[PDB]
């Protein structure tokens, strides 16, 4: 809780009392010289930090902030829709235990989710020779979620699915469903933050959130707020100078999508998580009417005098032909 | 005591080609929409159109409920229609008194459900269901209702 | 049987307040195609004697063979048979799943093989081994698993287990930090034993000390028998006089002889999903049930309703 | 690089009768509302008259950055009203090049926040504060803008 960085990669103070170690980096960020000031160890520690950062969207301190272009990319395949590149990827020989976490992210995807169980149960057992943490960590959280899944699965074929469909459709073996209920029997998803060695309780606690429920209640609580606020300024006439109250939801649902699909995390297809994209696109598509339309006395646009006009991009459309339904999107036209 | 004031619901599906009894108790969200509207059509052309009365039209309905019917969903387990008959009552508001009831009869209903409700937590059960109002190219269907209040 | 119920509900209520530990004796170990201790007690012999022994190995014989093989061959050879006898991978059994289900906040062992360290890790519930002097300091988690018995990790060497009389003789210098936390165990918690016989000197004589140490405050630790003949009503007696508690599978269920793997299912069945109010019976059982959770809601003037969800699990 | 686009911003305030600056420069959310309306409160009138063109009228503000002085602040710790300024630049579209600061000047102000955030949480600091641009009765008042771009 030392600093407190904002979502667009600007940091501000928070509870620093001692030497802005974020100030002298951010300094050091421009100072070739300085950057020359460094043994060639020293110099890769800050190169590999530079190559961080930029990866993870932070710019520079508040205080210099000037017009940021955060760059946005989504770069797992599950998400451009590749399912016969991807039927390719996991016929290939794996080498490492990553790919074997990929791998296993990808057979979940395209419905083959036996599998995956047994594939995980197999990278779980093997992972710990290696001394990684959080593969481990993470493989657990996937196979809860994808047992979550089949349990589901099974039940609502058998209620009506045999209505649905017509036959009732077994897709699992009856040894597994019973092994699956055995294996996972007490599990209790709370305590496995709190289950790990302190080791692993010092580096990625940041990792924390996934384990309960709450990962999906901090961000939904959030965007409840903002689309209070920007409801509130519509019907107002107000314009908003910088970042609208808007942006800062279009900011955080790429954030939030780019953590939830890089990182193989099987989260994806859950309908909480639908329910998140949901009002986040369609409060952005509100917003955009809204400017559409009104009036102005002379300084109105004299105040931002463009739009995003919300360009629909590529990756708009397949969040929308992903995460709605026929039911929600005639909802949308409608207005 | 104070205030809130609720209601209840009765639901009754049928396959045809015999009495085959599906049916639940109650109906909470039981959201029931009807709609009717138009975009565009026709060519325009031969002046006189002699006619005119496209209006699409279709219902949706909603129900909850765990109860499938105990015998042969089992029976089954190891495209007839699914014809359903609501059923309620209405009070006259003067007296407050149980004087009618309402049937409702839909003849042919086709059933879509959106079959990706994988929720994150163990829920309490309520396996929404949602129906769609189907009619062939012959007559009639849709909406016949039965009504009470002969006092 | 009312003692039974007993003895479950006294279980299931440890499980709740996570005062659970179990203690795994050989049954457990030998559910897995694991080679018993008479096997490789056979197989000294075999190279002492030339031949094999003839008649079930005394107690005393069980220490004095090994300790003639160490006097005589040597460290090598002890060694060596045992690098043969223990160098092999075998896969983990239901039951040391359903073990690990009950959560139990530590875990004992006289088996001196790793698959329970399998068991745990593939769960997911993370222990902090200790089975040398060493570990004890190192330990992180809060969660042990305690090898009394010494362990391979370190190497298939004759110094890393107990295998031979002078060390049941020398146990109290060789691993006593073990000895006072395995002391601290029994005294703190409810402890069960499963696929334990009932002849282990040393660790008798250890419960027996610590029921005279701690006279009418011993919370007695629980035993579950596993032989398919029931046990006798005297037996019982005298073991229930010398200040345990006893739970016979055989009661439970009926199989044959050899179906141990049966039994052992059926007892820790009944143990974990007994989730158990099942037991209410009558009619006035009821009302002292749902006063038991409901009365201590009276310092608070009103509850909300949904939230009566959490007081009754 | 793919889409976000930013700008900037910046809040003056001043005090009346001194060159005192007590106050924030960079204004976070910087939402910014007119509003004008009309009722019946003249809803009768004598007639033969011209009008009054009341239109009520009103402007509201408010800026989150804070930190408003230290020097000023330690004097005063020991009502002209004030007066703001805001301060922003344009930029010709065709050209995207900077090569206008607009200027506008509000004279009269009266800073009347909820002085109770009581969050439950604490947060990075920032009291959003809100502003009502005051008016008498002499003249001018609301506001007066000026523009660059003399290019």
Redesign the interface.
């Known amino acids: 809780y030392d600093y407190?960085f904002e979502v667009?990669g600007t940091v501000?103070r928070?509870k620093n009392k001692g030497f802005g170690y974020m100030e002298r980096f951010f300094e050091l960020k421009e100072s070739c010289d300085e950057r020359s000031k460094l043994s060639k160890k020293q110099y890769e520690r800050f190169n590999a930090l530079f190559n961080f950062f930029e990866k993870n969207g932070v710019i520079c301190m508040a205080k210099d902030?000037?017009?940021?272009?955060?760059?946005?990319?989504i770069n797992s395949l599950a998400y451009h829709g590749k399912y016969d590149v991807m039927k390719k990827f996991i016929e290939e020989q794996s080498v490492s235990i990553e790919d074997d976490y990929k791998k296993a992210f990808f057979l979940a995807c395209l419905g083959r989710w036996e599998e995956s169980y047994d594939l995980y149960?197999n990278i779980?057992?093997n992972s710990?020779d290696e001394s990684n943490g959080c593969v481990y960590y993470l493989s657990?959280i996937n196979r809860y979620?994808i047992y979550?899944?089949i349990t589901?699965?099974v039940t609502?074929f058998?209620?009506?699915?045999?209505?649905?469909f017509?036959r009732?459709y077994k897709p699992f073996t009856d040894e597994f469903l019973a092994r699956i209920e055995?294996?996972m029997?007490?599990?209790n998803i709370d305590?496995?933050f709190n289950?790990?060695?302190?080791?692993f309780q010092k580096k990625y606690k940041i990792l924390e959130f996934l384990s309960d429920?709450q990962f999906?209640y901090d961000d939904t609580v959030k965007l409840f707020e903002l689309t209070n606020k920007v409801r509130s300024?519509m019907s107002?006439?107000?314009?908003?100078?910088?970042?609208s109250?808007d942006?800062v939801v279009?900011?955080r649902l790429y954030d939030n999508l780019r953590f939830l699909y890089e990182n193989c995390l099987w989260?994806v297809?859950?309908?909480?998580?639908h329910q998140y994209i949901r009002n986040s696109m369609s409060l952005l598509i509100e917003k955009a009417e809204y400017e559409r339309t009104r009036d102005i006395?002379?300084?109105?646009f004299?105040?931002?005098?463009?739009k995003?006009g919300f360009?629909m991009?590529y990756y708009d459309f397949v969040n929308i032909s992903r995460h709605f339904?026929i039911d929600d999107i005639k909802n949308l036209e409608r207005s | 005591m104070k205030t809130v004031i609720q209601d209840t619901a009765d639901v009754y599906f049928k396959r045809k080609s015999d009495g085959k009894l599906v049916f639940t108790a109650e109906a909470q969200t039981a959201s029931f929409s009807q709609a009717i509207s138009e975009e565009k059509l026709r060519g325009g052309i031969g002046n006189k159109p002699l006619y005119i009365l496209k209006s699409e039209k279709e219902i949706n309905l909603t129900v909850k409920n765990a109860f499938?019917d105990l015998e042969w969903?089992a029976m089954?387990?190891?495209?007839e229609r699914?014809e359903v008959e609501y059923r309620t009552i209405a009070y006259n508001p003067d007296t407050e008194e149980v004087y009618s009831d309402i049937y409702i009869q839909f003849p042919n209903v086709s059933?879509s459900?959106?079959?990706?409700?994988?929720?994150?937590?163990g829920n309490a059960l309520a396996?929404e269901?949602k129906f769609e109002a189907l009619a062939d190219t012959d007559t009639d269907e849709m909406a016949v209702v039965i009504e009470a209040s002969r006092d | 049987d009312n003692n039974v119920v007993e003895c479950i509900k006294e279980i299931t209520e440890s499980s709740r307040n996570g005062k659970l530990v179990f203690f795994v004796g050989a049954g457990v170990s030998t559910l897995s195609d694991y080679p018993q201790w008479w096997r490789l007690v056979d197989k000294y012999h075999e190279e002492l004697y030339g031949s094999p022994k003839k008649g079930n190995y005394s107690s005393d014989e069980y220490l004095r063979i090994p300790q003639i093989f160490y006097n005589v061959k040597g460290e090598m050879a002890f060694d060596g048979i045992l690098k043969d006898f223990f160098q092999v991978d075998k896969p983990t059994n239901?039951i040391h799943?359903k073990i690990l289900?009950?959560?139990p906040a530590h875990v004992i062992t006289t088996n001196y093989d790793n698959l329970i360290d399998?068991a745990c890790?593939?769960?997911?519930?993370?222990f902090s081994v200790i089975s040398a002097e060493e570990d004890v300091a190192n330990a992180?988690?809060s969660?042990y698993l305690l090898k009394v018995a010494g362990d391979f990790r370190k190497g298939f060497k004759g110094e890393n287990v107990v295998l031979k009389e002078d060390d049941y003789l020398n146990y109290d210098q060789n691993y006593p930090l073990i000895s006072n936390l395995m002391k601290t165990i029994i005294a703190t918690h409810t402890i069960v034993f499963i696929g334990y016989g009932l002849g282990d000197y040393n660790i008798n004589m250890l419960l027996n000390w610590v029921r005279k140490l701690q006279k009418d405050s011993f919370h007695k630790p629980f035993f579950i028998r596993t032989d398919p003949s029931p046990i006798e009503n005297e037996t019982l007696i005298y073991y229930e006089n010398k200040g345990l508690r006893i739970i016979d599978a055989a009661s439970l269920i009926d199989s044959n002889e050899y179906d141990y793997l049966e039994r052992y299912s059926a007892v820790m069945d009944l143990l974990?999903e007994s989730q158990e109010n099942k037991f209410i019976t009558k009619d006035d059982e009821v009302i002292d049930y749902i006063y038991g959770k409901i009365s201590p809601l009276f310092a608070l003037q009103y509850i909300r309703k949904i939230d009566l969800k959490h007081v009754f699990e």
């Not at chain 1, 058998?158 to 649905?164: E, F, S």
């Not at chain 2, 089954?76 to 495209?79: H, K, L, R, Y």
């Not at chain 2, 459900?113 to 929720?119: D, I, V």
């Open positions: 407190h667009n501000v928070h902030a000037g017009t940021l272009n955060t760059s946005i990319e149960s779980i057992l710990i657990q979620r979550q899944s589901q699965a609502q058998n209620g009506l699915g045999l209505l649905t017509g009732h055995r294996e029997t007490n599990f305590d496995l289950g790990m060695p302190f080791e429920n999906l300024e107002e006439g107000s314009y908003s100078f910088g970042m109250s942006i279009l900011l989260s297809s859950f309908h909480e998580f006395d002379e300084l109105g004299s105040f931002f005098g463009k995003s360009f991009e339904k | 499938f969903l089954t387990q190891g495209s699914y059933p459900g959106e079959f990706e409700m994988s929720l994150e937590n396996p269901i | 239901p799943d289900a009950m959560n399998t890790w593939k769960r997911g519930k993370y992180t988690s969660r974990i």
